[PDB]
Amino acid sequence: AEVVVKGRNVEVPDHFRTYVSEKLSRLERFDKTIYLFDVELDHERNRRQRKNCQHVEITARGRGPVVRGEACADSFYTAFESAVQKLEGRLRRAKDRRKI
Amino acid sequence: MPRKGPAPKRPLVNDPVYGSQLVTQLVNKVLLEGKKSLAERIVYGALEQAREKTGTDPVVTLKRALDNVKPALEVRSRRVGGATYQVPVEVRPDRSTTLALRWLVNFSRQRREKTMVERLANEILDASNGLGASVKRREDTHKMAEANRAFAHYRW
């Protein structure tokens, strides 16, 4: 499970590295089909007497073909949590749906 | 040009040396890309080597091999409800000539003669007798079609 972590326009704290590792690591748990993950972290809303909109994109080449998956949230941890919930359900569906 | 109906196809001129639709169509399916002239040298040289190993008209040997590889039924693909069904379907004439020439060229290309001319000569000869791997692919395609006859009803 190769895990590339890019910004977009943003610092990348050691809390973000660890949290990224553990949410995305849920996927290593039960989807053995994985290969590369590419994770890229946008930061707008900021600068406008308002609350910053984070965005997370995640790319995932499974064993086979390419998921993508995009999430916008007021903060970063809540967004990456949500993104991993979605990915887990999908994959088991791409696990699912088949078996005769 | 699918989903609007059938699309009009290009008319194909016949061969200068041999005078057949099927020789020129074999040339256009020999054409690993770019060199139609070199495809003509492969097909022509292979059919005069067939002329050497038969002593007859080469296009009769070609059409007899083409007949002995030509399939009648093809399997496919429709997955009704969570199970993949090999469905056997009647093959059109042009589809059958296409599978005959395309199998002939590709499994000549797998064969282990030195040049391409000796490969295509030996594959047209072995398909004329019935001893190539391409005839075994015709028998395996009719093996999948006759083994899967029941699923054919959908009328599809």
């Binding site: - | 199970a83 006859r149 029941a150 699923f151 054919a152 009803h153």
Partner: protein
Amino acid sequence: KKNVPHGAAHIKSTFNNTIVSITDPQGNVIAWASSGHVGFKGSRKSTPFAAQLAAENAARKAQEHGVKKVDVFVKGPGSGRETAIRSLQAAGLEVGTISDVTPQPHNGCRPPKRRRV
């Protein structure tokens, strides 16, 4: 073994297969032919081609005991009634009757309730 001058077919066309016995007027069955015994198994057993091969093998084992004329008795809902009648009229036995004896309860025992898949 014996000779039978004419007999009656029994075709059980119940969705997953058709079991084709033939029977004299007495009702004893000379031989029984089924799709499963042809070699098909599972969902291919349900197919009408399985009924055609079941009536083919039933008509050959029928013809080995010398039956010529047959009155066909077909059972209830399923795929392979007129296909089995077709393979019987081609495979050595002739038409006769086509009698649709479906076992009809009249709100009898309560049927299994509902399949939600």
